[PDB]
Amino acid sequence: TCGIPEIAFATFENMEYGEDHMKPDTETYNWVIQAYTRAESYDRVQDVAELLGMMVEDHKRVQPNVRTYALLVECFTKYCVVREAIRHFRGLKNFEGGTQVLYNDGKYGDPLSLYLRALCREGRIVEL
Amino acid sequence: HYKTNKPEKDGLFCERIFGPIKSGICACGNYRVIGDEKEDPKFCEQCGVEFVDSRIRRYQMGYIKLACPVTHVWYLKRLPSYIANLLDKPLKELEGLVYCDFSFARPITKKPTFLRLRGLFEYEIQSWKYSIPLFFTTQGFDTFRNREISTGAGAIREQLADLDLRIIIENSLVEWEELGEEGHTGNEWEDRKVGRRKDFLVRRVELAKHFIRTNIEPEWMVLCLLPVLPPELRPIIQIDGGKLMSSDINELYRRVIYRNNTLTDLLTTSRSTPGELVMCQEKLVQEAVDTLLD
Amino acid sequence: EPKFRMSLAELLDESRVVPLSVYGDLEVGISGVQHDSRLVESGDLFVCCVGRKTDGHLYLSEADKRGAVAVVASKEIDIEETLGCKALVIVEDTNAVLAVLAASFYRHPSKSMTLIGITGTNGKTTTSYLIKAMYEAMGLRTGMLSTVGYYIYGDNKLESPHTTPDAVLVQKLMAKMVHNGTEALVMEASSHGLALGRCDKVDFDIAVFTNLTRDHLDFHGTEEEYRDAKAKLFARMVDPARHRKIVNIDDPNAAFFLAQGNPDVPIVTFAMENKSADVHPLKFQLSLFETQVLVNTPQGILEISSGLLGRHNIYNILAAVAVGIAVGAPLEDIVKGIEEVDAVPGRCELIDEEQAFGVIVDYAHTPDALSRLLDYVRELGPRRVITVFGCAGESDRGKRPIMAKIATDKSDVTILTSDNPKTEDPLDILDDMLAGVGWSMQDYLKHGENDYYPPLPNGHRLFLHDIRRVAVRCAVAMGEEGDIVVVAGKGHETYQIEGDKKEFFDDREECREALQYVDELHQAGIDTSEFPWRLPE
Amino acid sequence: NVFSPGELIGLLRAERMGRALEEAICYRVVLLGITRASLNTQSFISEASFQETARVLAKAALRGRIDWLKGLKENVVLGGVIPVGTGFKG
Structure with missing residues (x-):
């Protein structure tokens, strides 16, 4: 911290x-x-x-574990390397309660939101 | 001083700006014991004394104001010029404006301008300029000219200052992607050229990215104020038979100081005198700084 | 000789100034007593001023602070603590004190000589000066006060910060003028000035309204309040066959005001379409330079004044023709009034006398006035409607988008500038105006790097610039022969407050210089058809 | 975004990233001369200011380089205990 x-x-x-x-x-x-x-x-x-x-x-x-997949998705997204971000997401989803972790009460830039916004701009809507 | 051996005021060795020469003895010549600040004026009413120590002359710094913006040598000198890499314009064009009289026409893309040639550096100011000024109000022309006509390095400073880095990356990547079309499939002479552009492009993207996350502002490369070394480090002791005791540092410093003063006065003294009088001495100031730096 | 009958206690006693509590007598020497503390001077008695903003106690406190000898208030005021004379008198009645502030002989001269009040919603100052010129041509010297300058009597006008000066100060100035240098002292105030009490405390010989509508609805809190106040002020001092009720019959507030008061006063209508008014243009000579009409009425004069506007100036000329014919039945006396109306005053100015494109300098800040002026210009503008204006800082934020929309809806090409920065950041309110047409300053700036500048979806064009001088000169230069350029940013105002400092660089001389130098610009080969001037090489 | 077209990265690094990342990293070994090696290092202060002093210093000022003082020559300039021998703390 x-x-x-x-x-x-x-x-x-x-x-x-x-x-x-x-x-x-x-x-x-x-x-x-x-x-x-x-x-x-x-x-x-x-x-x-x-x-x-x-x-x-x-x-x-x-x-x-779950936080691993969570943390990873924030980094790749924020840095705009979206292709790897999606590969990781496949895993967080398999876990239950995952979405809750990725949005950490919206504390740090709302990582969950950032993912969705990016996927769209990239036209990756099948993934959306 | 000329045969007085006392530092002059507003001088390269001035006590007030750079600290006292002998401990406790002020400009006036009285002595108050340093080591005690209980009842000692840090600055005397008669003079700025800074009574504590002569050591300060080793560490204290002073600055010189310059009327004209000038450019640092290193960024411009390297073949992959840092300024050029940011500019995305021909190296010759940016340099020509800098060392010779040529005038840019569209300096700022930040604000809208009524005149619309949108040109680059152009040698000819033969375009009607007097009637334009007569038609325009006093300084109405100035607002328009500042927006449009550009000279010296104030132009570079301003063009660098309002630039969109995030946008610069976007254009570059696209151009980089488009280049390489029919790559590796031509006469030796051609591929070489295709590549050289190909790299300039990567290099430029990199410089900009760093600027986005580094807290250093791109405009600082052209310099408004100029720094001065502390007075001791340039001893310039009387050349009492040493004959080299006076520093070349000092010799170079005076020249920049002089041309700058001539300009500050010229502008104040003669608004009437044309840009030709100012143009003549602008180049002079720049060259002194250049030799001092590299 | 600033005033008279105000430097003696007996003069105030004869003026029915009963404060119920006084110390000694008003022995201090004062030329004219002023209810307002700012209007009063040191060592001069200052009566209580009645007003919604400043009450009697606040007025007495300000007078005692400024050094007034006497201060009137409901409670005990310690005026002698910071005054030149220890004698003071506190009046518990603010209205009575404000009425007695004007001297008896001072109020008697202005009421006896003459008086003409014009309180209208739109086009009041256009008719006030016309009536003043008609009275001057009749052979009686008089002055007409306006919102820009307070002129009780005489040709010259004294500088006043507010639109309506203090009633006591106005009465003192009118008395000083009528004593020497003026034959008549006419006090003319607008609807707000009449509702405040400036022109109400004066015997008005003729009280006519140029345009009766909803005035001071947000201030007074009720419609037709200013008209009712004007009618009451006219009924207070009314004479048989001496008061004129010349007003447009189409306005119901005008008829409501004419219904009140003494019925023995002469009533008449200045409406053109109405047959009962008997007034009609009966001519087709409308132009940007001069619009002459052949009025055919039994009471009105034959010839009319040349007005810059199509209907507003025509209505003002029709309203002034009645006041001009009331004094003299012959139409030859109205020639001076018609010439003064065609002199192109500050408000709704006409085109310049030089052979060039038409230039109309107007005063349009509110959305409704801007819209009606734009409609009148569209009705007058033969080919194009070129306008340039801006918004003031720290003003109504919702006013900018509606103004921009109403401007772009009926104008082919409009320029948006910063009329009054006043410490507000530039390029910010400009973006607010640009957001009205849905554009953003980013969209324009990134289009400015190119040479296209796409137009509006309706086919019109929109330009903008930061500085006012260059943009105004371009708008004056970017105009067709039959087209006229309208500058609705500022009219009679001559102050541009850019930030903390203010510059007085807004006038018609700049437009004249631009229209003179556009010939040299065209001879040089510069293209001023659009905003991106095509510069040769 | 991760890697620019002509850059020098270390072998162990590249290898690790390649397993991890499906993004294609294309690389080939470059033998570096003794002189070139020094110029590409972690310390602007000394490790790199042994030959081209002006050029290095400029590139760095622009990039705001931060040097963690982890080598010998660098700590000598600063007049502080070198992290070797008695100085290495354990």
């Missing part, structure tokens, strides 16, 4: 290259993604993609 994305990456790094007791879990990846997604100063999108890649690499140990 600080505003500086890096302070969190430093804590993540202590964990990822450490002993087993301290290894990252699904909750952890999710906290770091938030920092990068809800940051106000620089591009921070390549970074999210790289982090996702690490999670995929540790597939056997870690699998996604």
Whole structure:
């Protein structure tokens, strides 16, 4: 919640290259993604993609939860890479109660709204 | 001073602007003990004293106001000029206006203008300009001219200042997408050209994107005020046989100071004198700054 | 010689100024007592002013602060604390104090010499000056007060901030003029001035209405209130066969006002279509320069005045013909009045005498007046209707879109500017006016980068510019021979408040200079057909 | 939006993104000379101002570059303890 994305990456790094007791879990990846997604100063999108890649690499140990799918959709949408956003949505939907998470009481730009508005401008109405 | 060895006022070494030369001894020559601010005028009634330390002359800064907008060298000099990358106009055209007398015709797309040639830099002002001024009110012409006719680098500053970055990206991507039609299918000479444009386009999109999220304003590249190094760092001690003690920093500084003063007066003294008198010395001011910077 | 009979306690006692509580006597030297604190001077007695905005207590407080010797109020006022004379008198009656503020001899001279009141909804000042010119040609010097300037008597008019000055100050000025330099002191006020009490506290010899309609409906709170007040003021001081009821018979308020009052007063109608009025144009000579009509009436004069408007100026000339014929039956005396009416005054000005495109400077701010003036211009405009105007800052926000719509509905090409910025941000109210036709300043600006400028769906055209001078000069230059250019932004006003500072750069001399230099512009080869001037190379 | 046409990205990064993203990333290895390598780095201060000082400084001022001081040469300029040896804190 600080505003500086890096302070969190430093804590993540202590964990990822450490002993087993301290290894990252699904909750952890999710906290770091938030920092990068809800940051106000620089591009921070390549970074999210790289982090996702690490999670995929540790597939056997870690699998996604709902917030994962939620957070991911906000980032890709806000940055206008809509094609990946839709791939992720397929998952949040399978979960129940999902829409509620994506709209976080409308607190941060109404991510749920942003998705719909974009899908339309892009003429992706089958998806709409 | 000329054989007085005291800093002059409003001078490159002035105590009041840059801090005192000897601790506690003010312009007048009395001494109040620094280390005590209990009953010490920070600035004396007679003079600005700043009684505390001579160290300030090392760190204190001063600024010079310039009548004419000028342009920094680095952005213009590089072959992928940063200003040019933002402008999307021929490099020669933006430069010609800058160093030679040529006049733009449609400086601002921000506000509507009655005259409508919508031209670029044009050498000829032979177009009726006097009758236009006579027909127009005093300064009615000025409002119109500012909107339309453009000169020096005030034009660059203004064109850069009202520009739509989000729009710039849109045009560029479309043009970039359209280019590459029949790409990689022609004479050696042609493909090379197709590519060079192809890149200028990426480079330009990138610069703009950064500007959107970086808090740095694009207009700051042309400069209104000019900074001055603290007086000690340019010791310019009397060349008492050293013969190089006076800094070239100081030598270069004086020139810019001078041409600028000539212009400020020229405008004030002679509204009647034509733009030819002002045009002559505008270029002079720009060149001094250029040498000082790079 | 500012006034007389106001520097003695016996003069105020004879004026029935009974305050029921006084200290000493009015020994302080005062030329003329003024009810308003601003109109009164230091060391001068100031009576209580009756008004909705300023009551008696507030008037007494302002007079004591300004240094008036005496202050009248319902309660005890400490006027002697900050005055030049310790003697003061507090009058518990605000209306009686305001009436006694004017000296007896001061009110007697203006009431005895002459008086002509003209309170009309539309075209009152056009007939007031015509009646004044007719009275001057008759051989009696007189002055007619207007909303722009307060002129009790004489040709010159003193500067006044409000449309209607103080009644006591107006009476003092009328007495000073009638003492030397003026033979008659006619006090003329509009409907609002008559309802406030400016012209009501004066014996009016002739009280006619140029146009009777719903006036001061939002202020008074009831229709026909100004007409009833004018009728009551006329009935207060009325003489047999001396008061004139010349008014348009089509207006019901005019008949309602004529029904009240003394029936022995002469009544007449100035309607053209009505057969009972016996007045009719009976001529076809309407033009932007001069519109002469051959009036054929038993009481009215034969020749009529040249009016710039089709019906409004004709109605004003018909209303003034009655006042001109009342003094002299011969129609030769109305020649000076007809010449003064054709002089193209500030309001609804005619075209310039120079051979060029017609230029009409009008005063149109309210939507209804702007609409009726636009309709009259359309009826007069042979080929095109070119208009340029703007809105004032911090004004009625809903007035801008309806004004823009009413302007674009009947005009082929219109220019929108900033008539009065007054600290309001420019290009903001302009966008408000542009939103009326559904356009946004973004749509126009992005079209301005091109050279197309698509027109309106109805076929008309719309232009805009920030600065007023260049746009007005272009509108004066962008006009056809038979077409006339109308400037409804400002009329007699000569003040442009751009932000905190105000500039007096709005006048007809600029239009004359533009019409003179358009010849050189055309000789140079510049194209002024549309807003995007085609500049050669 | 994610990647511009001619850019230098690191191998481990690119590889990770490729698994994740269906968007086509097209890349090929470039061998970089010892000199070029330095010019492309995380620190404008030192790592990159060893040769073309004016050029680097300008590009950076425009982009508002922020340098986290994580190397040796950079901390030397600032006159602060270098993060190596006794300085590395553990």
